[model samples]
Target: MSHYKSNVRDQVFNLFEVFGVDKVLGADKFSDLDADTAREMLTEIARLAEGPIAESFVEGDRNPPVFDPETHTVTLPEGFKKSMRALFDGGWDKVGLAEHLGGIPMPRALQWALIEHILGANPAAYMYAMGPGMSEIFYNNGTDEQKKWATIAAERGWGATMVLTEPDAGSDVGAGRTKAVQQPDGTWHIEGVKRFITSADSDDLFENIMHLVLARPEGAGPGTKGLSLFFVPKFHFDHETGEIGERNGVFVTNVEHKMGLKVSATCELSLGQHGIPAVGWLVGEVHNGIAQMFDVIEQARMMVGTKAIATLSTGYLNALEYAKERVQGADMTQMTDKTAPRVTITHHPDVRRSLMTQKAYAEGLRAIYLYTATFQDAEVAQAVHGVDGDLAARVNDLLLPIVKGFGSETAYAKLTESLQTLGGSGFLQDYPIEQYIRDSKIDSLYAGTTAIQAQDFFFRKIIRDKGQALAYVAGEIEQFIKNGRLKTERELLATALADVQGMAASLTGYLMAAQEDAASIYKVGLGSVRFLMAVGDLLSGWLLARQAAVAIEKLDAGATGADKSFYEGKIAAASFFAKNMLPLLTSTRQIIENLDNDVMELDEAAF
Candidate 1:
C-alpha cells in the first residue's frame, strides 16, 4: 500500500538504450556494475524505496519534527526515523562515491536513477541522509586531515548540513556577515547565526553532525570574495579515532515554520554566542570559498530539480491510477446521449489531456535531468554525444539552471494538472497529491529561487561559458530533428529549438544593448524566466522526440505485452509533449522577441 510509484523500465531504457550509459558501465571504475547488476540494484532499491522508505511519507508531513526549545533539539517522527534507517541500512546513498566510503562507484546516470526513487518516495529521508554526499564533496576539496574526517563522517554515518544563509542574507550570499576569527591554534572560531539551515541538529538520528559553514574572516575584504568555507562539527571529534566529545558551540537556536517539507527541519543555527567557541577548519585551507561552495550548490541544485521531477512522476502515477477508477462524466463522443454509460474519467478527453500533460512533463523532465547527468561522466558523454571531458563539464553546467529553475516551475505547475485529474479528491488530504503539492513547493526555493536560477541560466552558465555548451546541445537537437521518421514530431521539436534559440538570441541582444543603454538589462530580466522555460521545453521536447524514435523501433520489432504498452506510452507521451507543449514556446518566443522595460521605467509609486 505504498503511494510511491516508480518507472524502472524507463530508467533502464534511458540509461542503456537511449543514452547508452552501459558503454561506461561494466568497465573501469564501474567494472563490477554490469547492466544486469545495475538493473538488479535499481530493482532492489526501488522495492525498498517504495515499501519501507515510503511508509512514513504522510506521517512525516502530518507530524513533523517537534522542536524542544529547552534542549535545542528537534525530535523526528518514529516512522520517519524508520524510513531513514531503511535508506541507510540499504546503503543506497553511497552508490556513486569512492570505495573508501563503502561505496560502489557507478555512472552518474545510474546514481541519479537510484536517487529518484528515494526523493520521490520521501524527500526528507533523502535530505537528512545527504551526509555521505557532503563527505564526498569534502573529500574532493579537503586537505589530508579533512579528507580523513570526511571518510570518518561517512563511515560512521554522521549527518551533515550546509550553512551559508543568514537572517540578513537570502539569495545574496555575498551579503553574509558571519565572522570567522583565526585562533592561536590553526583552527578558527566561527561567530555568526545562519538561517534556513536544514538538518542542523537531530535529537537521536545522528551521533554527530558536520556543518560546512561559510564565514568571512575579520580582516577579509567584502562580498563573496571574502567568504571562506569552514568545517564545523556539532561535537568535537578525535581526528584519528573519530570519537565524539563535548558539544561544539554551534547550536540550533530556532526551527522555522515552513510552508512545506516540514519533516526536514529548517533551523536557525547560532554559533559562538554561548561560553564556548565554535571551532572550525578552513576547507582545503583555501580562501576561494564561493568556488568551493559552488560545487555543493551545483549538486544541491541538481538534487532539488530531480526532487521536483520525482514528485511529479509519482504525482502523475497517482493521478493516472485515480483516472482508471474514478467514474465521472460519460464519454465525450457520447455527449448527446442522456446515459451512454457513465465511465471512468479515463474515457473523457479532457481528463486524458491532463493525464497526458502530466505524463509528458513527468517523463520529459525525467529525461532532461538524466540527460544532464550524461555529461557528469566523460566516458558516457563521449559514447553518447562524442564530447570530451571539458566540454562534457560545460554541458553539465549549461543544463544545471534549466534542470533546476525550469524543472521546479514546470513540476509545480504540472502537479496542479495531476491534482485536477482526481477532481475534488485531489484537494482532500485523503489523497497524497495534496501532500505532494505541499512538499514540492519548497523545491523551487531550497537552494535558490527560480529567478536566481533563470538569471544564472542566462548570465553565468550560458553567456559566461560563451554559449559553447548551448551550441553543442542545440546542434545535437538540430541534427536529431533531421530524422526522416517522426517527421511532424521532429518539425515540432525543430520549432521549439528555434524558438528557444530565438529567445536566447534576443536576450543576448539585450545584453549587448546594455553596453550603450544600461536600462536595456531590465528587458533581459523580464525575459530571462521565459527564455529559461522555453529552453527547458525545447530540451524536453527534443529528448522525448528522441525517445519516441527509439520507441517506434521497439514497436516495429514486435514489442508485445507489457513492453508494447510501455513503448506505446512513450510514443504517446512524447507526441503529446511535442505537439502540445512545443506550440506554447512559439507564443513565448513572440513575448521574448518583443521585450519591454516599461515596468522597470515606472515610478516608485506605480505599483
Candidate 2:
C-alpha cells in the first residue's frame, strides 16, 4: 500500500475554480505568481512527497528519534533526515515567506495546498523542516538584530522551536515561572525549564536551533500580561556572518517517547541551568510577548488543522483503494444466496456510506481550510468575498478556532471510519491509518485544547468582536443559500444555516440571561462544543453544496473522462453530506435551546 496519495484535483478546483485565486495571481503583491507556476509547483511537490518524502514514513516510525540526556541531543533516523534534506534543499520552505526574504509571494491558499502534500505524505518530515516558515513569523515580529537572525534562519535552512510550556504551565501559560533578567548589553538571561518543546535538539539537522521563549521579566507582574518573548538560540553565532560559536545555556534535559509522530523530537529544555546563561534578545524589543506570540500561535493552529485534514484525506484515499480491491461478502441484493459471487466491499451499503462520509469530510474540510486561507490576505479576501482588510482579519480570527478545533476533532474521529473501511486489517502495523490516528490526536491536544478553543471562539472572537466577523460569514452562507442551485442541496444548506443561526442565538441568549442569573453562563459552557461542531457541520454542508453547484454547471457544459467522474463525485459527496449530516444540527440547536446547569451544579463527589 502507498504511504500517501495527493488529492491534487480537489486542490486545483479549490484554488482556481472555487476560490478564484488565479484572478489575483498576476496582479498586486502576487505579481510573481500565476496559475501555471502554482500548478507546476503543486505537481512537483506531489511527486516529491509521494516518492522520497513518503519513503521515510514507515522507517521513521519504526526507528523513532533517540534521546541522549547526557549529551542533551536527539538523534533523528537517517531516513527521516534524508527526507528533511530533500524538502529543505528543494526551496519549498521559502515559498510563503516575505518577498524580501527570497520567497515567492503567493496566495496563502496555494502555499498551504503545496504544504498539504508534504504533511500528508510524511507529517514528521514536515515538522523537522518547518523552521523557515516559523522564521518568517519571527522575522515579521522581531527587532532589527532579531530580524537579521530570522533571515539567517531562513537562508541557512536552520531549525526552530517555540518554547512556552513548563512543568506546571501546560495550558495555563500565565502560570509559567521562567524568569528573564535583562543584562547590561540589552541581552536577557532566560532561566527556567520548559517542557513539551518540539524539535528542541536535533543532533545534526541544522547548524543552530532558535527557541522562541516566553518568560516573565524579573519585576513584572504575574500572569500572561507580564510575560515577554525572547529569541534564544542553541548556539551563539555572529550576527552578521551567521557563523556558529559557543553553545548557549539551553539544553534538552529529556525527550518524550510518544504514541505517534515519533520522528519529531518532543523535549524538555532547560534554560540557564547548564552553568552558562541562556542569552536572549527581546522580540520587537518590547514586552508584548503574548500579543506577539499570538502570531506564531495562529500559524501553528492553522498548520495543526491542515495537517489533520491532510492526514484524513490520505487515510480516506487509502481506504477507498483498499475497499475497491479487497473482495468480501455477497452484495445485499444477494444476501439470501450463499452461492452468490463475492464482491468488493465498495458494493456494500455500509461500506459505501462509510466511504462517502470520509469523502464528504476530507473534501469539505479541505474547502473549509482553503476558504479560511482566503482571509489570510487582504487582497484575496476583497477579491473573493468583497470584504475589506480589517473585517477580513476579524473573519480570520472568528474562524481559526473552528478550523483548528473542529477540524482536528472531526478529522480524528472520522479517520476511524477510514480504518473501519479496512476492517480488521486497519489495526495492523502494516497500514498507516492507525499511525495517522495517533499522530492527529495531538493536534487537538496542543496549540490549544478543544475546550480552550471553544472558550476563545465564544468569548474572544464572537462576543468581543461584536459578531462582526461571524455576521460576515453567515451573510455569505445566506447568500449562497439564496443562490438556489440544486434544490435539495440548497434546501439542506438553508436548513443547516438556520440551525447554526438558531444555535448562536440560543447561546447568546444564555449569555444575556447570565447577566442576571450567573448560573445561566454554565449553559453556554455546556453547549459550546456542540455549538462548535454544529457550526462545523453547517459550514461543511454549505461549502460542499456550493461545490456541487459548480460541478452541476461543469457537467451541463459537458466534461469527459476523469473530469466527468471527478465532478460527479463532487456532486454525490455534497448531496450525500447534506442529506446525511445537516439534519443533525436541528437536534443540536434544540439541545442548546434547552440547556441547563445541572451538570455544573452536580456534586464533585458524585462521580
Candidate 3:
C-alpha cells in the first residue's frame, strides 16, 4: 500500500453531501454539468489517483534528482516522470481552468477536492500537471497575441513557471535586479540569474515552457511597481502553428539539492547569457507586472495550502492505521503491573493522546481549506454563508493567508507527532511521515513565507479591511454557537468562537497602539504568527462543526453505507478538534494581548 490512502468517499461526501457542489455546477452559468456527471468524473479521477498515479512515490523519493553542470540539466528519476505522465494522461490537469482553455470550468471547491487526491498521492506530480492551470492567469492578463500563445501552450502540454525570485530577492521581490531591455524588433532581452525556481527546466518532458518573467525595464520606476511581466519561452515557437523552433536564451545554471520534492527541480536559471538572448514579449503589452502576477500568486498560495493539508490527511491515515495494529506497551491502568499483557500502542494513553492530537490538526486543517475553497465560488458562498458576489471575494481574501500560513504550520507540526507516534519507524524513509514532513516544509516557505503571511493577515486582510470580513465570519460563528442546529457541541463551540473574538480584539488593540507608538507595532508582528494560527483554530472548529451539522442532517435523512463512515469521521474530527485544539487559542490570545517589543529592540549581534 502507498503512503496515501485516497479518501474518495469523504471527498465525494464533502462535495455533494456537505457543500452541495452539484448545485453550483447545475446553475445557469454551469448548466452544462449535472450532479451525476460530476460524481462520475470524481469517481474516475479517484480511481486513477489510487492506481497507476500513485505507483512511483517511494521510488522517486529514494533516487531523487541530480543536477549536471556540463549539460545545464537536472535529471529526475524515471519513476517521477512516469508518475507525472500518469497524471497528464488522466486529463486530471484541467480541473479549474476556464472553458475556453479546454477545461471543465468547475468551482474551486470541487477543483480542490480532486486536487487533494493527486497531491496526497504525489505532490510534485500534481504540481507539474498543474502547469496549464498556473498559466491561465497569465492568459487572462496577457496581450491578445500572448493569450493565443497561452492557449497553444495549454493544448501542447507545455509546462509553465512564474519567475520572480533571484539569489538576493526571495521574499523581497522588489530587490530583484533582472533587467529587460527592449529590442528594436519589439521583443525584449531578459538578462539575469533566477534561483530556486520550481520546474525551471523539464528537458524533453515538455514540448516547451512559458516563463512569466519579472524584470526591471530600462528607465522604469523603482520598487515592485517598476517591474514588468514578460512571457519568455524555453524555445521560440511558431505563434500560429504552435511548432517549437529555436532554443531561447534560458538555461539551467544548476539545480539545488533540496530536502524533498526532488523530482520537481529547483533550478538556478541563467537567462540571455547562454549565447542567445532570452527574448520575451511584454505580457498584456503593459508594464503592470506586479498586478498581473497577483493572479498567479493568489492561486499559488491556495495550492500550497491545499497541498499541505492533503499531505496531512494521508499522513494521519498512515499513522492511524499503524497505531491500530502496532503492539507495544500495556494500557495506562496496566502501567504498574509488570506482568500485564502487552497490547497495541493505541491502548496507551499517551499514544492515544498523540494520535488524537494528530487527528485534530490533520482533519481540522482539511476542513479549514475546504471551507475557504467554499468561498471561491460565489454561489456556494451565498448558499452556505448567505453572502453575495463581492462579499464572497472579500471572504476569500480574508482566508487566503490563514489557509496558507496556518495550514502549513499546523499540518507540518502535527505530521511530526504522527511520525513520533510510530517511534523510530517514523524517522526512516521506510515510512511516508518523514517525506511528508520534508515535502510540506516548503509549503510554508514558498508562495509566501510565514512571516510575510503574518504581516499580510494582520495589516492588509484584517486591519485594512477594518474588521468587516472578520466580523462577518465571527458573527456567523457566534450564530452557530447560540442558534446552530449542532447544539450538542454548544459549549465547546462557544468557547472556541469566543476565544477567536478575544484574539482578534487583542490583535486589533495592538494595531491601534501602533499608530500612537510606532514601536508598539512590532508587538503586533511578534504575535502575528500565533494570532494567525489562533484564527485558524476558530475557523477550523466552526467549519468542522458546520460539517457535522450537515452530516447529522444527512444521517437523519438516512445516509447509509460509506457515507455513514465519512460523515461519522466528520463528527469525530470536529469533537476532537474542539476538545483538543480550541483550548490552545485561548492562551494564545492572552499571549498576544500581553505581547512586548523587547524582542524587536534586541541587538542583532546578541543572538
List, residue by residue over 454-481, the lDDT tens digit for candidate 2.
Answer: 9888888998899999998889888887
Error of 3 at 549 (Å): 2.3
| Candidate 1 vs candidate 3, lDDT winner | 1
Clash-forming residue pairs, model 1: none
Q: Please, what is the whole-model Cα lDDT of each candidate in the order they appear? A: 0.90, 0.90, 0.82
Residue pairs whose backbone atoms clash in candidate 2: none
Where is model 3 poorest over a 10-residue stretch in terms of lDDT? 481-490
Q: Give all candidate RMSDs, comma-separated.
A: 1.0, 1.2, 2.0
Model 1 bad stretches (over 4 Å): none
Residue pairs in candidate 3 whose N, alpha carbon or C atoms collide under 3 angstroms: 143-284
Clash count, predicted structure 2: 0
Estimate the lDDT of model 2: 0.90
For model 2, what is the error of residue 143's alpha carbon versus the real structure, in angstroms, after optimal superposition?
Answer: 2.2
lDDT tens readout by residue for model 1, 477-570: 9888775558889888878888888888989999999999999989999998888888888888888888888888988999999989988988
